[PDB]
Amino acid sequence: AHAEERLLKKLFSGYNKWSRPVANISDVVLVRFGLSIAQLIDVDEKNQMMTTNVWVKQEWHDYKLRWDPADYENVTSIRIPSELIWRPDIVLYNNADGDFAVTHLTKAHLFHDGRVQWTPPAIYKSSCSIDVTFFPFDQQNCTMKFGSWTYDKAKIDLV
Amino acid sequence: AHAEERLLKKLFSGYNKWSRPVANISDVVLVRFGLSIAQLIDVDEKNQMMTTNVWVKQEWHDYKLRWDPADYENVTSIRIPSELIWRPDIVLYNNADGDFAVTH
Ligand SMILES: *[C@@H]1O[C@H](CO)[C@@H](O)[C@H](O)[C@H]1NC(C)=O
Ligand SMILES: *[C@@H]1O[C@H](CO)[C@@H](O)[C@H](O)[C@H]1NC(C)=O
Ligand SMILES: *[C@@H]1O[C@H](CO)[C@@H](O)[C@H](O)[C@H]1NC(C)=O
Ligand SMILES: CC(=O)OCC[N+](C)(C)C
Ligand SMILES: [Ca+2]
Ligand SMILES: [Ca+2]
């Protein structure tokens, strides 16, 4: 716990959250992006919206958050606030009456090799076109478009 | 008042609210958890939803916030804002268009 305070003091001593965490400019940050649906809250046919509860599973490597476990009483991983670190700005392009980015900001699971795991919850209201030709036997196909807003492929790449 | 002010200065001199409060990492923070329902605001059968007003009683042990009352004018307990200390992030998994965590 004194190591953890020492660890957190060490990691955030000279950390800059506004700069992409790459040791080399030409490097590209790989973001492993995956969804986990909790419940399909609503499918508003009249407004052609879909409200879903998901866990936006993200994972990227931050080269400035690495430490040797042997030097810190063998700390393998720690939980750090997500508002203190640089997180990719993945937004829902086809949003409708909802939030573009993830707003909860739960803590992230940081490992000793720089890997960061972040799985915040979210409630997204995405617009999807609804066909009611065979209602009430219809089959809707509603999509969500996720991508980094500011960073292009040469800087942030999704997996 | 002076005793409590000195106690507050001492307690948070080097307190890190981001670090789990255990003297030994092998320890696990036991969080005694319990609800106290206040009123069933609504049960929306149409939306398959229930709205409740509850008090999320939580209780844990923090090791870096200990003191001897004899050294602080016999002050046994104090009230401090919850945002200044480490807290468990207990949330409602099955949330439906509502706030996940405690916001007050
Ligand atoms: C960054 O990557 C480029 C392209 O591979 C390489 O030429 C350059 O030497 C690298 N810089 C450092 C400091 O390693
Ligand atoms: C659903 O929509 C996506 C994109 O519009 C399309 O690629 C896919 O083939 C569609 N599937 C069905 C079963 O309609
Ligand atoms: C922590 O607990 C483990 C096992 O209970 C023990 O081996 C170790 O010495 C303890 N360390 C401290 C600093 O109390
Ligand atoms: C540079 C910038 O802000 O681009 C945002 C728009 N988008 C997602 C179409 C690239
Ligand atoms: Ca409906
Ligand atoms: Ca009702």
What does this molecule look like?
This is part of a larger assembly, with 2 copies of chain A. Chain A is mostly beta strands and 159 residues long. The first copy, chain A, has a single domain (1-159), classed as Acetylcholine Binding Protein, Chain: A (Distorted Sandwich), CATH 2.70.170. The first copy, chain A, is 6% helix and 39% strand. The first copy, chain A, is built from 1 helix and 10 strands. In chain A, strands 2, 3, 4, 6, 7 and 8 form a 6-stranded antiparallel sheet that branches. A two-stranded parallel sheet of chain A has the order 1-10. The radius of gyration of chain A is 19 Å and the shape is elongated. Chain A starts with a helix and ends with a strand. Chain A binds chain B through residues 1, 4-5, 8-9, 38-39, 41-42, 51, 53, 73, 75, 79-81, 84, 104, 106-107, 121, 123, and chain B through 14, 16, 18-25, 47, 63-64, 89, 91, 93-97, 100-101. The structure holds 2-acetamido-2-deoxy-beta-D-glucopyranose (NAG) (3 copies), acetylcholine (ACH) and calcium ion (CA) (2 copies). One calcium ion is lined by residues 42-43 of chain A. Chain A: This is Neuronal acetylcholine receptor subunit alpha-4. Chain A: Disulfide bonds join 128-142. Chain A: Belongs to the ligand-gated ion channel (TC 1.A.9) family. Acetylcholine receptor (TC 1.A.9.1) subfamily. Alpha-4/CHRNA4 sub-subfamily.
Supply the key terms.
part of a larger assembly, 2 chains, mainly beta, Acetylcholine Binding Protein, Chain: A, six-stranded antiparallel β-sheet, 39% strand, binds 2-acetamido-2-deoxy-beta-D-glucopyranose, binds acetylcholine, transport protein, cys-loop ligand-gated pentameric ion channels, cation-selective channel, acetylcholine, calcium
